[PDB]
Amino acid sequence: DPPPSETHKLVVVGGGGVGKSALTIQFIQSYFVSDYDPNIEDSYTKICSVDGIPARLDILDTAGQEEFGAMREQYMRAGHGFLLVFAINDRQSFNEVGKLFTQILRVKDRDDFPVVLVGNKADLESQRQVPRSEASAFGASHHVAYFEASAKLRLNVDEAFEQLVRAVRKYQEQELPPS
C-alpha cells in the first residue's frame, strides 16, 4: 500500500579526472581500486533508501570538459538533479564547476535546480588548492549543500548522493501545480 518507488535521473558533472566515476562506482557497488580503470558498463543504477523512502536512481557520469554546447545540453536535459564534482587538490576543476552551475540553470530555466556540490579527494588534504571555506562559501551563496568527499576512503559518498535525492524530492514537491 505504500507509494510506488520514484525513479530519479542524476547526472554527475565536473572536469575529467576529478573522480566522477570513482564516486559513482563507490556509491553503487562500494568498490575503489587505484591504478585500475576497466572500461566497464557505465549505466549505473541503484535502489536507494533516503529518510526511509526507497528510490530508483539512474546515474549518468559526464565525460570531460565538453566543448560543444549542443552535446553538453543533452547531459543536462537528462538530469533531475546534478552532483557537481571538483577535486580539492585542483583549483582549475573548482573553476569549471562555477561554469557548469550557470549552464544547468540556463538549460532547466530556474534559479534553484537540485544541485549538490562535492569537493572530491578529501584524502589528499596535504595537496589542497581550494580552501574548504572558499568552496562551502560558493555552496552557501547558491543555496546548495557542500560535501568534502573521498571516493578512495568512501567518505561522504552516500551522504552527498542522499542529500541530492532530498533536494530533488523537495524541488519536485515545490514544482507541483500551482508552482
Binding site: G16, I40, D42, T45, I47, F68, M71, Q74
Partner: protein, 541 residues
C-alpha cells in the same frame, strides 16, 4: 513447480461477483500450456513465458481498474523469477572453443604469450585467433594520420608554447579537427575506390593511400602484410574473411564501418565477438586476459595488510607467477617487488614446488550454461565484455545482434546525413548535437548523451562511445531485453542484483593483468596530459 499453476493464479486473481473475461482466460490457458511443455526446448518455454507476460499486459491495459491487477502484477514478477529458474535448471555443454581476436595489424608477441597460457592448460579446447587478412594496415593508417595531425598541430603552436591557451585541451581539440579532415579524406577515398573496383581489398586501398599521401614505401608495407599474415597463421590464425555466417549476416557492414572508417579495432572486435558467440559458440577472451589462478596454489600465503583490494592481490599473484616461472617474458614485477622479503620468499617457495602449469592456472574443464544466456565478466562489480561464455545460437547472442543493429541505426541515421554535407569537425559536431537533441526522449537520453563523442573515438580523452554502441552496454541491453520479455531496449537501467545472474565465473579468469591496464582504444585526462608533454618534448627538444 517453480511458477504458479492455473488454480493458484485463479485464486490469486479471484474477484467475487466478477466475470472471467476472455483476456483473463487467455492468461490461464497460456499458463496451463506452459506447465505441460515438458518436451520443449528451453527457448520455446521462454517464448511461452513471453506470450503469457504479453497476454497479462493486454488484460491490465484493457481493464485498467480491475480488482485482478494487483495479483496479475505479482504474477508478472513470478514470470521474471521463472525466466531465472528456466535459465538455472536446463544447462547445455559450452563448445570447447577459446576465441581471441586480433585485427587491424600484426599480432604482438605479448598477445601470443597471454594466449599460450590459455592454450597450454586447455589442451581439450580448440584455440581460434580471429584476424582479418584484408586489413593488416588499419593500425598503420591510424598511427600515421594521428602522427601527421600531431605534427601539424605542434607546428601551429610554434611560438605560443608558454601561453596558458596552448595546453593539452587546446592541442587535442585542434589535432582532432585535423584528424577529422584527414580521416574523411581517407574514408571518401575508400568509398570511391570500393565503388569503382569492388575486387579491391582494404589493404590494397590503404597502402596506395599511405604511399600517395604520406610517402610510405609500398615494399615495407607489402613485407609487413606478409610478416603479419604468417605470424597469425603460425598462432591459430582464423581469418574473418572465411567466416561466412559473419560475412553474410546483419552486422558485417557495421564491423567494416568500425574497421575501415573509424579505425576502432576494439569496436570492430566488439561486433565480431557477438557473431562468434551466435554462430560458433564457446569462450571469448580479450587477448589481455589470463587464465584463472588455481584456487589452491596460494591458499597458504596470507594477503598482507598492505594489499587492500582483491584486484591488487590478484595482480601481486600474477606478477609472482611470471617473475619465478617466466611463462611471459617482460611481464612486469613492479608490484610484486614492493612486497616484504618474507612474502616474496613464500611465493618463490610455493612456485618452485610446482612443475605442471595446470597446477598454476586452472583448466576450464567442462562448462555448461543456459541456452538463453551469454555469461559476462565483472570488474569493480560492473559487467565488461572482455570475457564471455555462450553455447552456439544462444537467445541473448541474438538479442545482442539486435542491440547492435538498433544502436547503429540511431547513430548512422542521425550522424551520416550531417557528415555528408561536408563541413569541418566543429560544424559537423554542433549540427550532430542539434540533431541528437531533436530525437531525444526520456527513454533514450542517456544513450543519446553518450554517442555525441563518436567521431572523437581513439583520438581524444574520455571518448567512451564504443562502450555504449558495441561494448558492455549492449549486454546490459540484452539482459534487460531477456528479463523484461522485450527487444532492443535503449534504456539500459538495470540493477547488478539482476546482472549477477549472468556472471562469468571469477574462478575461470584473471582480469588484473598488466596489458588490461593499457587500453588500446580510449584514454583519460591524465594520459592526455602525459601525452601532450611528450608530444611537445619530442617535437622540440
Amino acid at each position: 513447480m517453480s511458477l504458479v499453476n492455473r488454480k493458484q493464479l485463479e485464486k490469486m486473481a479471484n474477484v467475487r461477483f466478477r466475470v472471467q473475461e476472455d483476456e483473463y482466460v487467455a492468461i490461464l490457458d497460456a499458463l496451463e500450456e506452459y506447465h505441460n511443455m515438458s518436451e520443449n526446448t528451453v527457448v520455446e518455454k521462454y517464448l511461452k513465458l513471453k506470450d503469457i507476460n504479453s497476454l497479462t499486459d493486454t488484460y491490465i491495459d484493457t481493464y485498467k481498474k480491475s480488482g485482478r491487477n494487483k495479483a496479475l502484477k505479482k504474477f508478472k514478477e513470478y514470470l521474471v523469477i521463472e525466466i531465472l529458474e528456466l535459465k538455472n535448471s536446463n544447462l547445455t555443454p559450452v563448445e570447447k572453443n577459446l576465441h581471441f581476436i586480433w585485427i587491424g595489424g600484426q599480432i604482438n608477441d605479448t598477445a601470443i604469450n597471454y594466449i599460450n597460457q590459455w592454450k597450454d592448460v586447455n589442451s581439450d579446447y580448440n584455440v581460434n585467433v580471429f584476424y582479418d587478412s584484408n586489413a593488416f594496415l588499419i593500425n598503420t593508417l591510424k598511427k600515421t594520420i594521428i602522427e601527421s595531425a600531431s605534427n601539424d598541430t605542434l607546428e601551429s603552436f610554434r611560438e605560443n608554447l608558454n601561453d596558458p591557451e596552448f595546453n593539452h585541451t587546446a592541442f587535442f581539440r585542434k589535432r582532432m579537427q585535423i584528424i577529422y579532415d584527414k580521416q574523411q579524406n581517407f574514408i571518401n577515398y575508400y568509398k570511391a575506390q570500393k565503388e569503382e573496383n569492388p575486387d579491391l581489398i582494404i589493404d590494397d586501398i590503404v597502402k596506395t593511400y599511405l604511399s600517395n599521401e604520406y610517402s610510405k614505401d609500398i615494399d615495407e608495407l607489402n613485407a609487413y602484410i606478409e610478416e603479419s599474415l604468417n605470424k597469425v597463421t603460425e598462432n591459430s590464425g582464423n581469418d574473418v574473411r572465411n567466416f561466412e555466417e559473419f560475412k553474410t549476416g546483419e552486422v558485417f557492414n557495421l564491423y567494416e564501418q568500425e574497421l575501415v572508417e573509424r579505425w576502432n579495432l576494439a569496436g570492430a572486435s566488439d561486433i565480431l565477438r557477438v557473431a562468434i558467440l551466435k554462430n560458433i559458440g564457446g569462450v571469448y577472451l580479450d587477448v589481455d586476459m589470463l587464465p584463472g589462478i588455481h584456487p589452491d596454489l596460494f591458499k597458504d600465503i596470507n594477503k598482507p595488510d598492505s594489499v587492500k583490494t582483491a584486484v591488487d592481490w590478484e595482480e601481486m599473484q600474477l606478477e609472482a607467477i611470471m617473475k619465478h616461472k617466466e611463462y611471459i617474458p617482460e611481464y612486469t614485477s613492479k608490484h610484486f617487488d614492493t612486497l616484504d622479503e618474507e612474502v616474496q620468499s613464500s611465493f618463490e617457495s610455493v612456485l618452485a614446488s610446482k612443475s605442471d602449469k595446470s597446477e598454476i592456472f586452472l583448466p576450464l574443464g567442462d562448462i555448461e550454461v543456459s541456452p538463453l544466456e551469454v555469461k559476462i565478466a565483472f570488474a569493480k562489480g560492473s559487467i565488461i565484455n572482455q570475457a564471455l561464455i555462450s553455447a552456439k545460437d544462444s537467445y541473448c547472442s541474438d538479442l545482442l545482434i539486435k542491440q547492435i543493429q538498433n544502436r547503429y541505426k540511431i547513430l548512422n541515421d542521425t550522424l551520416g546525413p550531417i557528415i555528408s554535407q561536408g563541413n569541418d569537425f566543429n560544424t559537423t559536431m554542433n549540427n550532430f548535437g542539434e540533431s541528437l537533441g531533436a530525437i531525444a526522449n526520456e527513454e533514450n537520453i542517456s544513450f543519446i548523451a553518450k554517442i555525441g563523442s563518436y567521431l572523437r573515438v581513439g583520438f581524444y580523452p574520455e571518448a567512451n562511445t564504443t562502450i555504449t554502441l558495441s561494448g558492455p552496454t549492449i549486454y546490459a541491453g540484452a539482459y534487460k531485453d531477456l528479463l523484461t520479455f522485450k527487444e532492443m531496449s535503449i534504456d539500459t537501467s538495470i540493477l547488478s542484483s539482476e546482472l549477477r545472474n549472468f556472471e562469468f565465473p571469477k574462478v575461470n579468469i584473471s582480469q588484473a593483468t598488466e596489458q588490461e591496464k593499457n587500453s588500446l582504444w580510449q584514454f583519460n585526462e591524465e594520459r592526455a596530459k602525459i601525452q601532450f608533454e611528450e608530444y611537445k618534448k619530442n617535437y622540440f627538444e
